[PDB]
Design a protein around this nucleic acid. Structure first.
Ligand SMILES: Nc1ncnc2c1ncn2[C@@H]1O[C@H](COP(=O)(O)O)[C@@H](O)[C@H]1O
Length: 299
DNA sequence: TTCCGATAGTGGGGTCGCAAT
DNA sequence: ATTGCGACCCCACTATCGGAA
């Protein structure tokens, strides 16, 4: 059950696409749940054992075969990640583990050589389950394109990029390294302010997690409100334009200065329009990952 | 000089587990 | 049996520091 001194490998957002320094392997980003097997016990993105019992009894069967196989769990792929998560519960089954990397220990292995062991043939013996995330070889900018579209058209959220001989990084990869890059696209939109919430400072005791990430609790007993803006309660704004759809909050994309000033004059913000961006192409109700850009009409 | 790699501290959505009523 | 909160999943972003470019 022993890791070593390891923290899972995390992709980097795709920016500066000219330094994407080529031959690489492109794979589709599945919205499952990150999972890593170590010594017969399945771990999560934060190294916290998977709660579901069937997947854990599944582990150590075999520890030697399911050792260090870094992957992501799901159930009923392209539809939704919501159901891909009755694996955090302590019952109710068919998780189809997908594997897309393996961890040796700690120069070191490259992905060419690492994505060589992952082709573990569990099938001939047992054949319960397990799939290998398909990797596509790409040589030029045109190949990432012409493929991200196929992934998107098939229903995946995004595309992942891996350097052919990148080393396993126990941390978050960077663009100059090129170890792991994710390609997920934002889409702009408009909204009208309808309410406010103030920012909340968390004063609970600070704790280290397994990966050394400083973590505090959300007990709400130590949440003491600052005098800044925390989030904007808004609705979609779209010859009447007017507002449509349910109410959703936008709590990210503000500078420290904007949060202070906007809260001081929040009364004047009701009824003024803002641009925001989000994911899941379309004006779908209940947007996801909303980010505030600016006001439709500055000053 | 400027960049950036890493951390900390805010925020969004969602499903489960569990104590409390 | 229901409620209600908090942990935990998937994230995004800004601010900051000190070493790297
Ligand atoms: N083929 C893939 N390669 C790398 N990561 C993937 C893949 N499919 C899904 N993912 C997930 O994408 C996450 C990284 O995105 P995030 O960090 O913005 C990882 O935690 C993985 O669980």
């Amino acid at each position: 059950t022993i890791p070593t001194g390891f923290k899972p490998m995390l992709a980097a957002t795709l920016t500066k696409p000219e330094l994407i320094k080529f031959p690489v392997w492109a794979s589709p980003k599945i919205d499952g749940i990150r999972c890593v097997f170590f010594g017969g016990v399945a771990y999560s993105r934060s190294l916290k054992p998977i709660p579901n019992p069937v997947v854990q009894e599944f582990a150590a069967a075999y520890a030697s075969l399911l050792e260090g196989l870094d992957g992501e769990l799901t159930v009923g792929s392209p539809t939704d990640a919501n159901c891909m998560q009755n694996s955090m519960a302590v019952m109710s089954k068919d998780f189809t583990f997908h594997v897309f990397d393996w961890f040796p220990l700690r120069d070191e292995m490259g992905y060419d050589r690492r994505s060589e062991i992952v082709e573990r043939r569990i099938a001939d013996f047992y054949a319960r389950d397990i799939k290998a995330v398909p990797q596509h070889l790409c040589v030029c900018a045109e190949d990432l394109d012409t493929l991200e579209a196929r992934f998107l058209a098939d229903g995946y959220e995004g595309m992942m990029i891996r350097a052919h001989s990148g080393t396993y990084k126990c941390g978050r990869s960077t663009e100059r390294e090129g170890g792991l890059v994710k390609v997920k696209r934002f889409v702009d939109g408009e909204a009208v302010i309808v309410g406010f919430e103030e920012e909340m400072r968390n004063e609970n005791e600070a704790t280290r997690n397994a990966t050394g990430r400083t973590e505090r609790s959300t007990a709400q007993a130590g949440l003491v409100g600052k005098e800044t803006l925390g989030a904007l309660v808004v609705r979609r704004f779209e010859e009447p334009y007017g507002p449509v759809g349910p109410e959703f909050n936008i709590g990210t994309g503000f500078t420290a200065a904007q949060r202070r000033d906007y809260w001081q004059g929040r009364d004047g913000l009701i009824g003024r329009v803002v641009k925001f961006k989000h994911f899941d192409h379309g004006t779908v109700d209940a947007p996801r990952h909303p980010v505030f850009i600016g006001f439709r009409h500055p000053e």
